[PDB]
Amino acid sequence: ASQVRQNYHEDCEASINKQINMELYASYVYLSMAYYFERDDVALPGFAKFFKESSDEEREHAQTFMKYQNKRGGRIVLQQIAAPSMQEWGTGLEALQAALDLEKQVNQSLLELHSTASGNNDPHLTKLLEDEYLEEQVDSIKKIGDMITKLKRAGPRGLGEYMFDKELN
């Protein structure tokens, strides 16, 4: 194996490769949303900015995992990035509800990875998950839930969506 590899189970190596793909998909989904909200018939620049940054953040998460794979002596194997499940995301609220579901899907995958790492007695990998991923994921989920509540209070359609969009800008 690698001259560096130590206490790194092939199962964790495989799950990290799966997670790289999932973070890249999430980046792609938020990229889709970002430009959906820049359509002339949608025109929600705060939502667009929010999801642009989210797409950037998820691709950075993916790259941290790739760096981690190399750090531990595993081999990055990239897989096809799936097309986003939708081409058009509906209302601001529906996009937020889709994002909340995706963040929780990612969170479940991260927790299943953490279970794999713990089961193989890899505390270097549990630390990575805990400090660089699971922490941000709970914060992102809380943030999106907050936004869902706020938009439902303001609107969620019409003038309330227009005003809520301004808080994201």
Based on the shown chain and the rule CB under 5 A, indicate whether residue 23 belongs to the binding site for Fe ion.
yes
User: CB–CB of 103/140 below 8 Å?
Assistant: yes
Return d(Cα 98, Cα 95) in angstroms, integer: 5
The size of the interface with a copy of itself (CB under 8 A), counted in residues, is 75
Query: Which residues from 43-102 bind Fe ion, rule CB under 5 A?
Result: 58, 61
- In sequence order, which residues have a C-beta less than 8 Å from that of residue 27 and are 6 or more positions away? 55, 56, 58, 59, 62
Q: Least separation, in Å, of the C-beta of 54 and a copy of itself?
A: 14
Q: Least separation, in Å, of the C-beta of 32 and a copy of itself?
A: 5
Based on the shown chain and the rule CB under 8 A, indicate whether residue 49 belongs to the binding site for a copy of itself.
no
Q: Which of 15, 19, 116, 126 binds a copy of itself (CB under 8 A)?
A: 126
Sign of CA dihedral 100, 87, 133, 16: positive
Q: Which residues of this chain interact with Fe ion, rule CB under 5 A?
A: 23, 58, 61
